[PDB]
Amino acid sequence: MSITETFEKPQRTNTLRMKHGTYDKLDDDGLIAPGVRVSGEDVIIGKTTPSKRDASTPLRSTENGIVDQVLVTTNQDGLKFVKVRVR
């Protein structure tokens, strides 16, 4: 009840819980966009959970490519879905 999660660039506040990889590649909607070149432990999906406990997806450590497609959808429960495919 009145406790969700949101895909948006996190920037530390009363929790600061985040991680090393940079978020500078995310857009304010919390998702990188196609064309952008990622690597290291870069953040591909920025998600938060309440004031702000970081719950974001960082790229696979040993990997690095270019974003090939980000898909935003909905489930049968009306859940916001996100699928980032990296090439």
Partner: protein, 45 residues
């Protein structure tokens, strides 16, 4: 500009929060994120 594309009708959507996740006439609940304008450089190798 355009912040999103549609799974099918290709129409360049782009809406804020509470707008659910559909499109115009093609209520496809899919939508693609649209490329960046920050041109990517490639090594010809």
């Amino acid at each position: 500009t355009l912040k999103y594309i549609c799974a099918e009708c290709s129409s360049k959507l782009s809406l804020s929060r509470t707008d659910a996740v559909r499109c115009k006439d093609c209520g496809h609940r899919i939508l693609l994120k649209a490329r960046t304008k920050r041109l990517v450089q490639f090594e010809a190798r």
